[PDB]
Coordinates of C-alpha atoms and ligand atoms in Angstrom, one line a residue:
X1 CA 17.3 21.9 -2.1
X2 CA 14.2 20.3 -1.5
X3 CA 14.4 18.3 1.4
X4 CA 13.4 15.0 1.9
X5 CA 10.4 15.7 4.0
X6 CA 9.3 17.8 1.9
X7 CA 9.6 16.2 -0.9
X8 CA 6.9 13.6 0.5
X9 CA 4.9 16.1 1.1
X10 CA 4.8 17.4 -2.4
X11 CA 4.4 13.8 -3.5
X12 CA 2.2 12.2 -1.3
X13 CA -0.2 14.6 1.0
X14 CA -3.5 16.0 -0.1
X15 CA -5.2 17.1 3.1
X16 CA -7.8 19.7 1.1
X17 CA -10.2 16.8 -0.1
X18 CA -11.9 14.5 1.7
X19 CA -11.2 11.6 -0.7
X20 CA -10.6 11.1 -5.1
X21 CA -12.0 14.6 -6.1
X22 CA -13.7 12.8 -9.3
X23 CA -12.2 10.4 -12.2
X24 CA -9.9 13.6 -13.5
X25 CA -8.2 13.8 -9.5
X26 CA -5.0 11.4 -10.3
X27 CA -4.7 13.2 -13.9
X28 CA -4.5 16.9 -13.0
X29 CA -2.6 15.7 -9.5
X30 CA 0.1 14.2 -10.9
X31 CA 0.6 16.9 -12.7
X32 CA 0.2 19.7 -10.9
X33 CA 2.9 17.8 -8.1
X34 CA 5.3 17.7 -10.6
X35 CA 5.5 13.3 -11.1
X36 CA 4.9 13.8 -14.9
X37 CA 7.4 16.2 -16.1
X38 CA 10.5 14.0 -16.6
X39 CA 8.5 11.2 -17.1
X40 CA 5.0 9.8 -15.9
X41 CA 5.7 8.3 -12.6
X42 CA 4.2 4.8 -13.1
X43 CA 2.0 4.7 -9.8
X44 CA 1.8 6.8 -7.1
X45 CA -0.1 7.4 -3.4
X46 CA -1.9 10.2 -2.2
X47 CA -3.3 10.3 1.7
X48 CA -6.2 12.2 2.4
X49 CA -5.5 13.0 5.8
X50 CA -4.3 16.1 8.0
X51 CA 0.0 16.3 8.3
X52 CA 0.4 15.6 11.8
X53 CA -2.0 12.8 11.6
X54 CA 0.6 11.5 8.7
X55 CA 3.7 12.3 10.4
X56 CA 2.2 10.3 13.8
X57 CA 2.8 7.3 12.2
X58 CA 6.7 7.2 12.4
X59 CA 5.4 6.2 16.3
X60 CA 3.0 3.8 15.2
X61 CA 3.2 -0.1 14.4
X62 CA 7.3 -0.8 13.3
X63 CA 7.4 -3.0 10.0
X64 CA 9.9 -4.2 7.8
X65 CA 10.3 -2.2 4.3
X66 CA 9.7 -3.1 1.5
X67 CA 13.8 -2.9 0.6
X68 CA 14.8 -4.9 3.2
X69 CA 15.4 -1.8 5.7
X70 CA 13.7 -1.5 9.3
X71 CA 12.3 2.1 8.9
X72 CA 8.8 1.8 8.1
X73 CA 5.8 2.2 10.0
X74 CA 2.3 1.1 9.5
X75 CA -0.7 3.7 10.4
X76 CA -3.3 1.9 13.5
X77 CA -5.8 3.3 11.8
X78 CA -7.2 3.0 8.0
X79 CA -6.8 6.1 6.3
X80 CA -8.1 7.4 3.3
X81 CA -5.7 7.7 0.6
X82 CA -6.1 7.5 -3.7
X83 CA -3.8 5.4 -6.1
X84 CA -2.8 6.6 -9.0
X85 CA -2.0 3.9 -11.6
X86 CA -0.5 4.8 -15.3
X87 CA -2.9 3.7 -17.9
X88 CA -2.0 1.9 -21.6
X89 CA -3.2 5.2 -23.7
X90 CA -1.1 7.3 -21.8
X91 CA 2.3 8.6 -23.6
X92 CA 4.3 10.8 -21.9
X93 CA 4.1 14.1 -21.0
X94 CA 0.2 13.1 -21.9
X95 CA 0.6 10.9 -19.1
X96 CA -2.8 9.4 -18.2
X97 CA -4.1 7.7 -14.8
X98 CA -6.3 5.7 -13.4
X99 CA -7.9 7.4 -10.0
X100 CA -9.0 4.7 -7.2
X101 CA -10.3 5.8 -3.8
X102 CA -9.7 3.6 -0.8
X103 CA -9.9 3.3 2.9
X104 CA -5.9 1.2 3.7
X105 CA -3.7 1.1 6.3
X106 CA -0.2 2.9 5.2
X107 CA 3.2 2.4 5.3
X108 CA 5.6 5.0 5.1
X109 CA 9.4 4.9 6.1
X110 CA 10.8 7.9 8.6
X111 CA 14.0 9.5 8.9
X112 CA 16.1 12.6 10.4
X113 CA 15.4 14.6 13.7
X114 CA 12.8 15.2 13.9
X115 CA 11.6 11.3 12.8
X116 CA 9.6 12.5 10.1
X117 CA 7.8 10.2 6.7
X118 CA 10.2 10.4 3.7
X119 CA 9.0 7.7 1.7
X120 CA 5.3 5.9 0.8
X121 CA 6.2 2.2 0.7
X122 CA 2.6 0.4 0.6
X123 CA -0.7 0.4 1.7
X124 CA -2.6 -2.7 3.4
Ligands
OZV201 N1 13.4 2.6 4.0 C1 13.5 3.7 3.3 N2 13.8 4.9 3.9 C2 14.0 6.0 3.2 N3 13.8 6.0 1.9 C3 13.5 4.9 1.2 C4 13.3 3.7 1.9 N4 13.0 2.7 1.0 C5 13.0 3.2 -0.2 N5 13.2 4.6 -0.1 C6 13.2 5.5 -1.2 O1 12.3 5.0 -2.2 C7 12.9 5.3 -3.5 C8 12.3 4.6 -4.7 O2 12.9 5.0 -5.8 P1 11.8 5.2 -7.0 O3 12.4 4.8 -8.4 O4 10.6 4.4 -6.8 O5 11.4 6.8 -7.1 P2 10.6 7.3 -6.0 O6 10.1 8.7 -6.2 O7 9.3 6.4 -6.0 P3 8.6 5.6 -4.9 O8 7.1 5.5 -5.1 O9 9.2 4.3 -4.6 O10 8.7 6.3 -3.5 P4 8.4 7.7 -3.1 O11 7.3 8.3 -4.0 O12 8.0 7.9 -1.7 O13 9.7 8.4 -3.3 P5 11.2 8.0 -3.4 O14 11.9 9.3 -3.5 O15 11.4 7.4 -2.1 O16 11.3 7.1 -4.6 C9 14.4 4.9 -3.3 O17 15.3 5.4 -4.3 C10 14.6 5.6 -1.9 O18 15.0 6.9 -2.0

């Protein structure tokens, strides 16, 4: 299957740009990483910023989750990252979004061996 990891990866990386490629970025994103195809995924994270630079932070600053669980990790550093945020026109699979650039601290929970992100939990 698709593992875990990887599964972040295919929701939450986008290394190739810089930061929001333009007001269309969370609209043909979504899509293209498969969040609208069941349904449109209400909001969603994506962290312009290389892999391993992503992955470092399951050593970085240990903070609680937001479910209660001690696995998540906050970045040192600010990162840039883009939210993606349903709007009120869209109907699914038309699934529209609103695309917001910003320069946040994340949080992502890790798991396995090797310790590795498996989850976007917030961004401060
Ligand atoms: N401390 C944790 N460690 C490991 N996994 C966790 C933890 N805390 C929540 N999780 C997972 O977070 C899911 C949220 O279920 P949800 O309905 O939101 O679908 P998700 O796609 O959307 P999210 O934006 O929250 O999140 P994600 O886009 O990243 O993807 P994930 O696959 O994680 O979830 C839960 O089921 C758990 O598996």
């Amino acid at each position: 299957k698709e593992t875990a990891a990887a599964k972040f990866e295919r929701q939450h990386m986008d290394s190739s740009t810089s930061a929001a490629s333009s007001s269309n970025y969370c609209n043909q994103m979504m899509k293209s990483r498969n969040l609208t195809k069941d349904r449109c995924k209400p909001v969603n994270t994506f962290v312009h910023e290389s892999l391993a630079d992503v992955q470092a932070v399951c050593s970085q600053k240990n903070v609680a989750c937001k479910n209660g669980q001690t696995n998540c990790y906050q970045s040192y550093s600010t990162m840039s990252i883009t939210d993606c945020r349903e709007t009120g026109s869209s109907k699914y699979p038309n699934c529209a979004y609103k695309t917001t650039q910003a320069n946040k601290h994340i949080i992502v929970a890790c798991e396995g061996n090797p310790y590795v992100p498996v989850h976007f939990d917030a961004s401060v």
